[PDB]
């Protein structure tokens, strides 16, 4: 259980993300925090990055909601980064219900290939989204 001699660090870390006295994390505050480290993202990208922590949909992040993202501390292993970046590379911008017909082409032409009948089992494993229309879902395997 966390104690009071190791919670001020997290409190001040949260304070860096909220200059004013409100307890709500705003997209404007993230915009101000960014654009000073070097990179300037689109406000749509800000919404995309900010809705990945929000749970109640209010558009603001509380300290308990921010702590579950602070939990993944500095080790840079596994996590939900690669499992989404691989899909983003494979898919297109806003692909959503991708055709997935070229899945065999992507698996064979690029990188090591599997058996011709092996990809049929992988294709048949996407029955969650009806028939076809492969999305970021069905990734509950990992």
């Amino acid at each position: 259980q966390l104690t009071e001699e190791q919670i001020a660090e997290f409190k001040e870390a949260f304070s860096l993300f909220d200059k004013d006295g409100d307890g709500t994390i705003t997209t404007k505050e993230l915009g101000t925090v960014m654009r000073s480290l070097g990179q300037n993202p689109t406000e749509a990208e800000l919404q995309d990055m900010i809705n990945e922590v929000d749970a109640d949909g209010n558009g603001t992040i509380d300290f308990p909601e921010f702590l579950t993202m602070m939990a993944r501390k500095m080790k840079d292993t596994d996590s939900e980064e690669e499992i989404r970046e691989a899909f983003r590379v494979f898919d297109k911008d806003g692909n959503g219900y991708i055709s997935a017909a070229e899945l065999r082409h992507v698996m064979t032409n690029l990188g090591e290939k599997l058996t011709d009948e092996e990809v049929d089992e992988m294709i048949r494993e996407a029955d969650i989204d009806g028939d076809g229309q492969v999305n970021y879902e069905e990734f509950v395997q990992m």
Binding site: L2, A13, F17, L37, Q39, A71, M74, K75, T77
Partner: protein, 339 residues
């Protein structure tokens, strides 16, 4: 939260002290070896009890260190299992990892066994890599929460090299002075320890006489009065001449950049130089005007005008013309430093 974070920080903290308890019990061995060798060089022979006790204290402090290393590696594997989802201790054993572990044990297992007592004592100056493991753990950049909060956006890696680069950048000069004055008393004991188990006498077998050869070889001078004879000195001279033919340029660059220039205070100096003699062209202008008036005044009046009074003023008139151009050159050139 409970088994999330918390326990993780606790395991990290209990791992941290294992790399710190292996520094005292690693430098104690080196200190005792140095003291024992320096005392035995011209004193009690092997039959004395000192050569039996001080040569077993090292053999004990070299068993405790390799006892601690295994536990530290076990804690690292436990952190790997906690951080990355797995429940087997065989998953996290790659060829590289086991090779590095065996290499570490081999390097830390060298010690004289209670002649060859110098051959098995020279390579004990290899436990000096533990300072890196201590330093990468006793740093707030790698041990904080705000650091990771503001550094996760840029996916940088906190290796054992990023900390060193930051320490070089923010505190230069001193990190070179310590490195260049803590290497003399490591590479000058080695030369005499190598030439004393061999052809003796000379002058390299005397401390403060072997800090002259290393100081005029580190520095790229060389004289030739003292040259090593055995292969140990002949091999360490060009290893102290390589680290020192590219370490005397970094410090020169730092000296050149340190307090020999500034950025926001040069505006004041530029303004001062602009308001100084570069804006005293009025002097030359008045000189030219008064000279060209006086020439006419003393050539077209005063009855008969002597040639000397005319030619003196005319010669100084030709003197006072190029001065205006010379000052205007600097006036135009000063604006090139305001870009």
């Amino acid at each position: 939260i409970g088994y999330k974070l918390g326990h993780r920080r606790a395991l990290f903290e209990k791992r941290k002290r294992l790399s710190d308890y292996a520094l005292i019990f690693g430098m104690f061995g080196i200190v005792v070896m140095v003291i024992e060798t320096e005392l035995s060089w011209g004193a009690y022979d092997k039959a004395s009890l000192y050569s039996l006790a001080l040569k077993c204290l090292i053999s004990l402090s070299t068993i405790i260190l390799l006892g601690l290393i295994i536990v530290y590696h076990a804690r690292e594997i436990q952190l790997f299992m906690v951080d990355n989802g797995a429940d087997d201790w065989r998953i996290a054993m790659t060829y590289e990892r086991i090779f590095f572990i065996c290499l570490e044990i081999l390097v830390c297992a060298i010690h004289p066994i209670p002649d060859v007592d110098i051959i098995l004592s020279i390579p004990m100056f290899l436990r000096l890599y533990l300072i890196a493991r201590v330093m990468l753990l006793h740093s707030k950049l790698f041990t904080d929460a705000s650091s990771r909060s503001i550094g996760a956006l840029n996916k940088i890696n906190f290796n054992t090299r990023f900390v060193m680069k930051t320490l070089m950048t923010i505190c230069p000069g001193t990190v070179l002075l310590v490195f260049s004055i803590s290497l003399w008393i490591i590479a000058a004991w080695t030369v005499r320890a190598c030439e004393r188990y061999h052809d003796q006498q000379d002058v390299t077998s005397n401390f403060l006489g072997a800090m002259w050869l290393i100081s005029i070889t580190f520095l790229s001078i060389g004289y030739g009065d003292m040259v090593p004879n055995t292969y140990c000195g002949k091999g360490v001279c060009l290893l102290t001449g390589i680290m020192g033919a590219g370490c005397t340029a970094l410090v020169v660059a730092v000296v050149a950049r340190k307090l020999e220039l500034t950025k926001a205070e040069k505006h004041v100096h530029n303004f001062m130089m602009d308001t100084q003699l570069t804006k005293r062209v009025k002097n030359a202008a008045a000189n030219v005007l008064r000279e060209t008036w006086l020439i006419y005044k003393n050539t077209k009046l005063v009855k008969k005008i002597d040639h000397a009074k005319v030619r003196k003023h005319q010669r100084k008139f030709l003197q006072a013309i190029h001065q205006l151009r010379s000052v205007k050159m600097e006036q135009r050139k000063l604006n090139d430093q305001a870009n």
